[PDB]
């Protein structure tokens, strides 16, 4: 098992089942749920582990930035081997070693073979430089709730499908290590797709805040697991949890 590299989740919650698919859902911006995720990451990162990045929601330059906050220099961890990165911002809006770009048309139906194609290729770097040995595979989705702003409701639920229809037989999960992974979703924005995720998750985690006299309260709901509530706040970086009554 895994560590969520947030001492107070191993402790309640227990380490995490490898790979798992675990969703961190941010239900309002205030609560600052993909800070947590980003935390995640970067302490992935920095223990040496091989990562591979969707990047989805935001520009590359500001991933770099937001990473940069975190003590994670993007550029050497891509240039050593450490972390993949698929911008599909980029590649959705037409604009570095690591970094792959996917081409022609990206269609719910036909961007799931194109994620598998550049997977197998990450994959096949680190089998040759024999990477995967002593280390653990992430993967980070930032974030799924992204689709909305060009598929239709529709349109993402049969891509969700067709994505888990595509990994059950494509060598990028069948020939190489599979990893452990990490999907954010900020927002509502539907709910019918919001259900799917929730359905393919093995752990959902869920973040919201709470307007108080004092100040806002932000908590962390343990929604769903294989087999609990925790206030938080911010040392600098560092989410620092409570398990609460």
Known sequence: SL?????????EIGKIKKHSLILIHEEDASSRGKDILFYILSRKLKSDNLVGM????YPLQLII??????????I??????????VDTFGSFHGIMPGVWYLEGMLSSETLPIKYAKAVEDHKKVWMDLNLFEGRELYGFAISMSGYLEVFTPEETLRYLETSAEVRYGHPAYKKYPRGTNFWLWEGVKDKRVLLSVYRRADYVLKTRSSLGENGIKRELLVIKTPKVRFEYEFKGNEPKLRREG
């Not at 560590?3 to 402790?11: G, N, P, T, V």
């Not at 969707?54 to 929601?57: K, R, V, Y």
């Not at 930035?65 to 993007?74: A, C, E, H, N, Y």
């Not at 050497?76 to 990165?85: D, F, T, V």
Request: aromatic letters at 12%.
């Open 76 to 85: 050497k961890y891509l240039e050593n081997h450490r972390l993949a990165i």
């Open 54 to 57: 969707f990047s989805i929601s």
């Open 3 to 11: 560590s969520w590299e947030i001492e107070e989740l191993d402790r």
């Open 65 to 74: 930035r937001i990473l940069s906050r975190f003590g994670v220099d993007v």
